[PDB]
Amino acid sequence: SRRRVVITGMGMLSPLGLDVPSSWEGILAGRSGIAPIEHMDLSAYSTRFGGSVKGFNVEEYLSAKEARKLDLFIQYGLAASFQAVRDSGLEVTDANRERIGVSMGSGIGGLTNIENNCRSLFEQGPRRISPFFVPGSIINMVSGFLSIHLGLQGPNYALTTAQTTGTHSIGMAARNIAYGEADVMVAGGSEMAACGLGLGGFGAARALSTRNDEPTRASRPWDRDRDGFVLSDGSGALVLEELEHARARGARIYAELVGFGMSGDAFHMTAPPEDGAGAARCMKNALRDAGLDPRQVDYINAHGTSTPAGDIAEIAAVKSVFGEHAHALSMSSTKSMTGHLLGAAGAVEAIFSVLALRDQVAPPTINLDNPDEGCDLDLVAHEAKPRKIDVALSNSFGFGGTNGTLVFRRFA
Amino acid sequence: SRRRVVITGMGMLSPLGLDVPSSWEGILAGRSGIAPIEHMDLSAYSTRFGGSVKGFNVEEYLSAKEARKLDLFIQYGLAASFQAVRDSGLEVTDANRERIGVSMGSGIGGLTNIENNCRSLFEQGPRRISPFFVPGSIINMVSGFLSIHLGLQGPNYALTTAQTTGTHSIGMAARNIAYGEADVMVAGGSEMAACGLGLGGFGAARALSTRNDEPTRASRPWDRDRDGFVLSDGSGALVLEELEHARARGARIYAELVGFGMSGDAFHMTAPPEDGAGAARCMKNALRDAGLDPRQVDYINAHGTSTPAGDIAEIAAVKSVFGEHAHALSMSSTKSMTGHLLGAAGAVEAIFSVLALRDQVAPPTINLDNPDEGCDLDLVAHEAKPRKIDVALSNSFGFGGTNGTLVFRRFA
Numbered sequence: 001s002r003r004r005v006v007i008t009g010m011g012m013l014s015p016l017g018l019d020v021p022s023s024w025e026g027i028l029a030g031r032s033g034i035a036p037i038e039h040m041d042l043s044a045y046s047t048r049f050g051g052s053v054k055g056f057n058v059e060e061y062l063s064a065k066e067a068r069k070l071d072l073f074i075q076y077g078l079a080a081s082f083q084a085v086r087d088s089g090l091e092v093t094d095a096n097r098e099r100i101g102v103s104m105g106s107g108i109g110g111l112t113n114i115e116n117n118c119r120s121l122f123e124q125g126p127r128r129i130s131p132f133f134v135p136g137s138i139i140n141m142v143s144g145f146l147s148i149h150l151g152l153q154g155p156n157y158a159l160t161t162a163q164t165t166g167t168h169s170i171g172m173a174a175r176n177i178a179y180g181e182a183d184v185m186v187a188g189g190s191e192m193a194a195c196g197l198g199l200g201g202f203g204a205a206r207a208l209s210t211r212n213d214e215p216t217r218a219s220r221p222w223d224r225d226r227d228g229f230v231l232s233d234g235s236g237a238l239v240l241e242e243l244e245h246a247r248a249r250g251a252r253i254y255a256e257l258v259g260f261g262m263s264g265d266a267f268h269m270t271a272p273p274e275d276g277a278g279a280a281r282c283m284k285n286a287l288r289d290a291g292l293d294p295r296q297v298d299y300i301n302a303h304g305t306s307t308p309a310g311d312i313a314e315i316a317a318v319k320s321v322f323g324e325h326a327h328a329l330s331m332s333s334t335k336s337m338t339g340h341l342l343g344a345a346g347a348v349e350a351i352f353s354v355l356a357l358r359d360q361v362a363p364p365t366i367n368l369d370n371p372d373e374g375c376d377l378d379l380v381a382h383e384a385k386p387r388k389i390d391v392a393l394s395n396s397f398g399f400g401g402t403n404g405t406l407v408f409r410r411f412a
Numbered sequence: 413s414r415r416r417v418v419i420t421g422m423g424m425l426s427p428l429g430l431d432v433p434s435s436w437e438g439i440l441a442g443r444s445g446i447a448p449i450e451h452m453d454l455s456a457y458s459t460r461f462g463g464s465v466k467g468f469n470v471e472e473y474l475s476a477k478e479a480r481k482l483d484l485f486i487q488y489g490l491a492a493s494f495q496a497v498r499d500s501g502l503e504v505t506d507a508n509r510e511r512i513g514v515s516m517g518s519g520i521g522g523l524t525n526i527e528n529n530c531r532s533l534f535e536q537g538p539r540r541i542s543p544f545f546v547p548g549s550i551i552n553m554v555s556g557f558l559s560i561h562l563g564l565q566g567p568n569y570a571l572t573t574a575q576t577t578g579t580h581s582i583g584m585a586a587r588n589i590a591y592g593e594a595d596v597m598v599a600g601g602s603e604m605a606a607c608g609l610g611l612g613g614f615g616a617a618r619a620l621s622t623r624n625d626e627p628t629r630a631s632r633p634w635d636r637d638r639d640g641f642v643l644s645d646g647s648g649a650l651v652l653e654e655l656e657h658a659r660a661r662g663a664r665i666y667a668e669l670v671g672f673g674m675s676g677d678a679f680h681m682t683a684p685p686e687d688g689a690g691a692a693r694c695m696k697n698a699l700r701d702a703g704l705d706p707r708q709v710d711y712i713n714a715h716g717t718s719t720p721a722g723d724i725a726e727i728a729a730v731k732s733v734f735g736e737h738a739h740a741l742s743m744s745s746t747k748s749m750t751g752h753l754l755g756a757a758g759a760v761e762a763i764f765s766v767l768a769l770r771d772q773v774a775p776p777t778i779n780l781d782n783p784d785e786g787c788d789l790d791l792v793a794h795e796a797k798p799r800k801i802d803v804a805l806s807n808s809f810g811f812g813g814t815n816g817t818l819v820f821r822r823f824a
């Protein structure tokens with residue numbers, strides 16, 4: 001019979017910091033993590049900036065010998081996972097190791113490593129491909145390497161649902177616990193797509209902002225002068241735990257995960273429908289799953305990518321789901337500051353949604369200077385808004401018309 | 413309680429055939445699909461052979477223009493999915509489309525596309541990268557494109573658990589239906605890693621058989637002369653359906669999906685533990701999920717990759733789980749004929765497990781000329797074995813120590 005699921009630990013690498021508290025301080029202060037990319041020569045690229053993780057030290061987590069074998073997206077996923085497990089206070093024992101699993105996903109996975117090995121292959125021959133190429137690059141190896149390091153023998157898997165990955169990963173890990181396949185899951189996502197193929201490939205789709213001369217203002221969700229998403233790196237991980245398991249060990253509980261929705265648009269490979277029909281269907285599923293009145297929703301962490309079609313589709317979906325209550329809730333895009341962490345977006349944004357509940361504050365949508373036609377909700381323009389938040393919703397929408405919604409509420 | 417899940421449609425591309433009946437005819441005849449890889453200079457490579465899909469015509473499924481946008485692994489996944497939906501007879505309507513979802517996965521995803529776009533990037537720079545590079549290469553686009561083409565609005569996602577992908581996709585899709593989130597799911601996996609990067613990547617780890625002189629004899633699970641797995645391409649898709657839904661429309665039911673097990677080894681990144689402790693937990697989890705005693709199992713489709721460590725771990729696991737029944741069941745590796753389809757292995761082997769139930773026959777382990785030390789189970793050496801099969805297991809054990817088991821039962 002369906003059990004309740006709470007959040008007992010969180011971990012993060014973002015363009016705003018090397019952990020949760022440092023990231024959250026940047027969020028509440030309206031700070032941009034977006035800057036010209038230093039790690040490669042992008043003079044031939046139409047976009048030369050993004051949200052980099054600054055000063056990441058993998059040797060806070062892993063031996064340099066093991067780190068060298070792993071794509072950055074695996075290193076970021078392990079860092080957030082280790083932080084979340086530590087933050088939980090959970091002790092892994094022979095008694096509980098079979099009941100603790102992991103679902104850390106990625107949208108694109110080890111593109112940097114795949115590019116570097118493709119260069120070796122093409123310039124020098126197959127004998128120069130790394131022996132660690134496959135286990136060092138494939139998406140499931142966050143879950144794999146975390147289980148090996150911590151001794152987690154529960155369900156072990158990874159989702160890849162493009163920009164919806166971190167939201168789906170957390171929702172499905174919550175379903176694992178809810179229906180008794182696990183008592184604890186580490187769940188979230190990680191992404192490092194800032195290589196030639198990543199910036200070049202999104203560039204070739206003309207999906208990215210090209211505001212190279214003012215990167216901190218590039219990400220401007222619902223602003224009339226927005227011109228596409230800002231590519232960002234990092235990771236979010238949460239420890240999800242069955243309520244009575246958490247209560248039994250005296251865990252600190254940040255919030256309860258009460259609702260999860262999925263829906264497919266069945267509309268277009270990359271474009272969202274302008275009326276937000278799939279996102280509305282996904283939110284309604286999530287609110288019904290949480291047994292809520294839609295009027296209980298106080299805060300929405302929007303997908304809010306800063307694309308022309310995506311941002312307006314979300315306003316349409318929120319108006320359609322919430323009717324007059326759409327004018328009472330606060331909705332913000334933290335991508336205004338972090339940029340778009342792709343498969344990690346829904347993981348970091350789930351964490352920001354939990355902290356909005358802990359601290360009773362709506363994070364701002366920075367850069368919202370001139371809201372576009374129809375973008376007339378409370379979008380928390382410019383500055384953080386202290387307010388009552390009992391229920392918070394986090395939305396993600398990705399390529400393939402794939403939608404995810406998570407519903408969190410305060411736990412007393 | 414929980415709804416029952418049945419299989420009403422199946423679809424496949426494999427090295428044996430461009431559909432299920434052709435593939436299955438090859439399986440029961442002990443035919444190898446392994447041959448030197450064509451239209452590709454493998455001179456500098458230690459492995460020059462594998463399981464290719466032969467004579468695949470994508471214009472049976474897609475326009476030339478839509479096919480040009482999509483990696484081969486996506487093409488293969490869509491072909492299996494379209495076959496499976498056709499085979500099921502299901503009519504998608506406005507009344508059921510929100511209850512029909514997709515979970516089609518891949519282990520490695522778009523290596524061929526990444527490789528071809530690397531060529532362009534290194535030679536000519538980023539402005540030659542295809543606009544469809546990202547959506548045409550990411551793993552969730554089989555689910556994406558299938559949902560868009562057929563108007564499916566149910567749960568839309570993609571698993572990526574390396575060589576466990578197909579088994580986990582089908583199992584979690586079955587959970588979706590059992591727990592009322594969907595009435596129908598298309599589930600399985602696809603793979604096309606026969607590029608420089610895949611042959612090169614696995615070859616650099618010396619994981620592949622190098623028996624270039626006799627490719628049809630390379631894949632020889634539990635044989636003392638085995639020297640690693642054989643890389644293979646293709647796809648499997650199953651239509652999963654709630655039982656009352658299938659009966660109401662007069663669906664042809666192949667078999668019932670009664671159990672799903674997951675575990676993590678938490679042991680090593682690429683190698684299983686010698687005693688198969690993880691594979692044992694996973695099978696026991698699957699049988700407990702099915703409410704079945706190990707004694708009720710009649711047929712196991714092994715993971716059976718032809719690796720020294722992998723094959724012996726599976727013998728140890730089966731002896732551990734099944735005790736005095738270990739010899740009574742039949743266990744075969746269809747990878748002896750198909751090679752190792754990686755993320756699609758669990759999908760095509762779920763189909764062969766269902767057809768073993770339909771036709772009351774254990775497929776052979778071909779090339780099992782000299783069983784290794786302790787390989788003394790009924791491994792169905794050389795030739796198919798007609799026998800009673802009421803309960804059939806399909807196991808996958810992949811990188812990161814990720815395990816999956818599906819339990820299928822005869823339906824009457």
Ligand SMILES: COc1cccc2[nH]ccc12
Pocket residue numbers: 172175176179180181584587588591593
């Ligand atoms: C039991 O585990 C699950 C995995 C995936 C999806 C699910 N929905 C309801 C339960 C469930």
